[PDB]
Design an enzyme around this catalytic site. Structure first.
Site, PDB file in Angstrom:
ATOM      1  N   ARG A  43      37.965  47.957  40.278  1.00 37.40           N
ATOM      2  CA  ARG A  43      38.417  46.600  40.604  1.00 37.40           C
ATOM      3  C   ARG A  43      39.668  46.159  39.828  1.00 37.40           C
ATOM      4  NH1 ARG A  43      33.173  46.429  38.867  1.00 37.40           N
ATOM      5  NH2 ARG A  43      32.772  45.560  36.784  1.00 37.40           N
ATOM      6  N   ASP A  62      41.635  39.748  31.430  1.00 38.78           N
ATOM      7  CA  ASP A  62      41.095  39.211  32.676  1.00 38.78           C
ATOM      8  C   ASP A  62      40.160  38.028  32.422  1.00 38.78           C
ATOM      9  OD1 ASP A  62      39.206  40.836  31.406  1.00 38.78           O
ATOM     10  OD2 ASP A  62      38.381  41.655  33.301  1.00 38.78           O
ATOM     11  N   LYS A  93      38.327  50.760  35.471  1.00 37.63           N
ATOM     12  CA  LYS A  93      37.446  50.214  36.498  1.00 37.63           C
ATOM     13  C   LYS A  93      38.199  50.153  37.811  1.00 37.63           C
ATOM     14  CE  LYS A  93      34.899  46.852  33.526  1.00 37.63           C
ATOM     15  NZ  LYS A  93      34.654  45.377  33.361  1.00 37.63           N
ATOM     16  N   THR A 139      35.706  39.748  35.813  1.00 36.53           N
ATOM     17  CA  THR A 139      36.752  40.763  35.886  1.00 36.53           C
ATOM     18  C   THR A 139      37.580  40.710  37.175  1.00 36.53           C
ATOM     19  OG1 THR A 139      35.440  42.335  34.564  1.00 36.53           O
ATOM     20  CG2 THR A 139      37.207  43.259  35.917  1.00 36.53           C
TER      21      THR A 139
HETATM   22 ZN   LIG Z   1      36.526  41.951  32.759  1.00 34.05          ZN
HETATM   23 ZN   LIG Z   2      32.600  42.079  31.576  1.00 33.96          ZN
END
Ligand SMILES: [Zn+2]
Ligand SMILES: [Zn+2]
Ligand SMILES: [Ca+2]
Ligand SMILES: [Ca+2]
Ligand SMILES: [Zn+2]
Ligand SMILES: [Zn+2]
Lengths: 526, 526
Positions: free
Chosen positions: B143, B315, B141, B59
């Protein structure tokens, strides 16, 4: 309705090869299918990443894998044409589907034959196990029909020209065939106004120049009696499917005690792809018509109450013409240097070996198998191998060149076909007595048709790259459970997969493919 | 209606990263889209074979490429976690999106920060050229939000837990955020009955056992207050899109003189994929909801009269759990030997180096970066490198191991990403000061989650193979001309492609990607 694909043996296997129906082209138009392709993709066992796994991504090697479970390294069909420099006749070029031992034959005027095919087909195996089996094979191209049917097929028919469907020498038209050819003659004698664009084809409608040609906007309008126009169009696929349906009904295929099999080679997608490339209105119309005609074909079988299983695949993938790629975000797409075509390359290598003006190599195109002339002496041959390698490996468009010994030294590949090395792909279409002394592979995104003023085909396959290897494999039978399996499988897997459904034993050591489980979830058809 | 995507600069760029939305999963359900994904695939610039081109298909590295035009070798984001054995604090493990210099921090309790990201994002570049630019980034998330927004983003928000969306330390909720979090709190406090199956999900409805778990039939029913259930479900994506829409409207993004940008990280597909695998009812329901929610999102922007361009990608790709693969014609699919997980592998290598019971290596999982302990002496280190390589290369599930020097010696890759070698992929996520001393790569079809009695996640990405690298890239703006380009492109191509639309200069030597022409046919947006 709900019923396992392996519940009982199907009474009819219908094997369809759509020529040049690449996984790319298949995937692009998938969201628009409403007919036969919709049936297959929404209800069937869907392998969208099948592989014609070998390097020689041409029609003959490809068709040779579909119903044999065998790679071209085993079928012996390593290209559409290969050189036998020891051949008795003058023309050392051999067509994949001819019997060159016939007098006065040449590769330009040959006698169709399955003699070159080293292994049985599924039809051949079924008939060996049960003599009552009927094995039928019809296609737009002789090599497709011949390689899918095999040497013991009952009926092998292909489009011979304006006269319609023909078979091997000596084989008279049956009443069904004369009737089909009458209908074909009637269709050919009529003008075709062309097709208006399906909604999805509207975006593809712009002209692209390539040499003296413009493509991208064609709609298959054609004059009466224009056989070339008919051949390079959806019309020939419609006719081939109508022929197949008529044969199925006339012979009562699937209506007897044993399982019968019919293989069907739909050639139009390939002529269209070569002539126009793959992303214009021409291919778009062709795929939509394919979907519609397949739908009508399946509906007719259903209405007849036939218990059939279908497998549909392609003999290889394909690749769009560089000129359009360059307009659509692929500026590095280019045509192969003319210097690499047969005449030029031989002249160049001769002069580098110190044998100027002589004939030191034989080749069929700007890539693939290259053969050293037999006349060469040991020392001469050695200088040729050295200089050819030196020149080719230095060329900016060349990816690599393998020697025959390097390929022979490679074990027959196993494991996921999507991650094979190039030499593994080469090994998969390597047959010592027919393969070249060298194998020339171009870099990705180099089209093996040079730029010329006057051009014919603008696009082709035949490369070792993913566009040309990747093909769909779709299995379907009424009531089965749909599943999708995106990991790589091989077309050589088709035979053992089908054999499992009809409980036909196939010795694993006689084939290259493995059985694909066609039952979603816990139960296994293998 | 008809209007070139490059006719004038768009007023809003909407960049959407669907976490773990692999090209395989995207392609499988493509024929069923009716909402936002239908819009993108039927009207947009469609690149179905995009690549998160590097080896580290996780990710953080993936999100770091999307709006930076830079590979992880340049962004410095080479994994979700990497070791800094020279770190001041006790925990040598660093989270990709933390500032480890903060006191009392550890990788388990970190302070979110974009400090690790070495390059600007598109938003950062736009703001550098024009200070009036608003740069917003929201995601499930931290990130994802942080890496797409970059250090100069105006608003960076991510789902923090049952409390809803949060930002960096010190950043108070705005009125919009408190309102969004109120709605989220209300949704969370309600039970969710679950979803009945879309027609296409019916075929996927069968149970699959993996350790103590059964997956394949889930419908996202959840109890009130079940935050884990909410997170691992379509509910979080619906909320993230509603938040994005509310932010767009509240800040009048795209309604001023300059171009604004909003990046949106939809995380649910990834939680679902890890928890259930990718071919069951759970992923199927999730993708269908994604299509529906994206449709409603785009409709709201349209109704507001916003001139926006959308890019949608992932991603990284993903891979189904081996247990279901084995039921669906992939019997060779298997889980990684427990012997290769961190504790075990270190113990094994220690004993082979003659340092039994010691700590000679550090690793994060059964593949990827391995680091030699700093305490080791030169001779000790040498024995470790020798023995690690010897043991790993002999292991049946190991594809290969690269040394740091081997990767460093590799030039930054160019050419078609679909045909890169493994070391080229490794080089693309190689950053000398953060990368391991060795890089361990498993064979294809080995899942890097070992078989255990009690299991959590059953499936994951992170491998160097095609399933994990291949992702869709879709661009759309009202009235543009649709085209499909099936050859490989990279996600690092996204930034220069978008920059061209808004006439933002980007020095080629500061990025890895190239500009993708988004105008079908003769004209070129680049
Ligand atoms: Zn990911
Ligand atoms: Zn993942
Ligand atoms: Ca263009
Ligand atoms: Ca099964
Ligand atoms: Zn062909
Ligand atoms: Zn062809």
């Amino acid at each position: 309705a709900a019923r396992s694909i392996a519940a009982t043996p199907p009474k009819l296997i219908v094997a369809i090869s759509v020529d040049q129906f690449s996984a790319d082209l298949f995937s692009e138009y998938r969201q628009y299918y409403t007919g036969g392709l919709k049936r297959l993709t929404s209800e069937g066992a869907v392998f969208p990443r099948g592989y014609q796994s070998h390097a020689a991504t041409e029609t003959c090697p490809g068709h040779s894998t579909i119903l044999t479970g065998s790679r071209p390294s085993r079928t012996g069909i390593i290209a559409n044409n290969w050189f036998d420099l020891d051949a008795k006749r003058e023309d050392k070029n051999l067509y994949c589907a001819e019997d060159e031992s016939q007098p006065g034959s040449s590769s330009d005027k040959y006698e169709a034959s399955p003699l070159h095919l080293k292994v049985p087909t599924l039809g051949g195996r079924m008939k060996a196990a049960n003599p009552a089996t009927r094995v039928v094979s019809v296609a737009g191209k002789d090599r497709a029909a011949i390689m899918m049917g095999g040497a013991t097929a009952d009926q092998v028919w292909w489009l011979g020209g304006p006269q319609g469907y023909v078979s091997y020498k000596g084989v008279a038209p049956t009443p069904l065939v004369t009737q089909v050819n009458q209908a074909f003659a009637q269709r050919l004698a009529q003008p075709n106004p062309g097709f208006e664009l399906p909604a999805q084809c509207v975006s593809k409608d712009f002209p692209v120049q390539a040499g003296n040609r413009t493509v991208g906007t064609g709609r298959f309008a054609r004059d009466a009696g224009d056989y070339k126009g008919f051949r390079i169009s959806p019309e020939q696929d419609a006719m081939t499917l109508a022929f197949a349906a008529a044969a199925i009904e006339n012979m009562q295929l699937g209506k007897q005690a044993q399982t019968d099999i019919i293989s069907i080679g739909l050639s139009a997608t390939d002529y269209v792809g070569h002539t126009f490339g793959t992303e214009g209105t021409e291919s778009c119309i062709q795929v939509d018509r394919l979907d519609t005609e397949l739908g009508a074909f399946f509906d007719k079988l259903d209405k007849d109450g036939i218990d059939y299983v279908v497998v549909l695949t392609a003999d290889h993938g394909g690749h769009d013409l560089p000129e359009r790629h360059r307009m659509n975000a692929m500026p590095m797409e280019q045509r192969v240097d003319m210097a690499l075509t047969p005449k030029a390359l031989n002249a160049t290598i001769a002069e580098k070996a110190g044998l100027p003006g002589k004939k030191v190599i034989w080749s069929d195109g700007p890539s693939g198998d290259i053969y050293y002339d037999k006349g060469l002496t040991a020392a001469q041959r050695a200088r040729v191998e050295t200089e050819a390698l030196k020149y080719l490996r230095a060329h900016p468009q060349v990816q690599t060149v393998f020697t025959k010994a390097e390929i022979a030294a490679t074990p027959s590949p196993s494991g996921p076909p999507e991650s094979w090395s190039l030499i593994q792909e080469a090994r998969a279409s390597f047959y010592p007595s027919r393969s070249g002394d060298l194998l020339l592979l171009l870099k990705p995104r180099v089209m093996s048709i040079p730029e010329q003023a006057v051009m014919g085909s603008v696009a082709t396959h035949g490369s070792p790259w993913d566009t040309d290897r990747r093909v769909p494999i779709l299995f379907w039978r009424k009531g089965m459970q749909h599943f999708e399996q995106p990991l790589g499988v091989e077309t050589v897997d088709i035979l053992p997969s089908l054999a499992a459904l009809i409980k036909l034993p196939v010795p694993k050591d006689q084939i290259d493919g493995r059985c694909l489980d066609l039952v979603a979830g816990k139960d296994d058809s293998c």
